[PDB]
Amino acid sequence: SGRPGRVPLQFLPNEARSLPPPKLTDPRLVYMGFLGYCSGLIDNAIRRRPVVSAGLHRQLLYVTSFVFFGYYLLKRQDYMYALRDHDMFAYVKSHP
């Protein structure tokens, strides 16, 4: 934060983009999937419901939700780490 260049609230710099996107079935990402899944399930169990079979609809909504947000969040993850690696190497050339 406060690094020269860059602008505040944008979630993700154009300076990224160049990094490869996470692939569709990156295990972390599918884990976001199940995370949403189980949340969708507890959604039933709390409200009594016949768990699992009921509301399979909304359950699908949850899993799509968290996998969706999980995607971009992964992109910003890789961007950030690639960023610190870059700054680090540039600085190690800066002061041999």
Partner: peptide
Amino acid sequence: LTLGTSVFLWIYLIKQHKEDVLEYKRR
């Protein structure tokens, strides 16, 4: 309604992914 929104978040996601890969190839 909600089911349609869900499918929409899919197709949008595969969209932006798909193009993003191409932009990756270009850059």
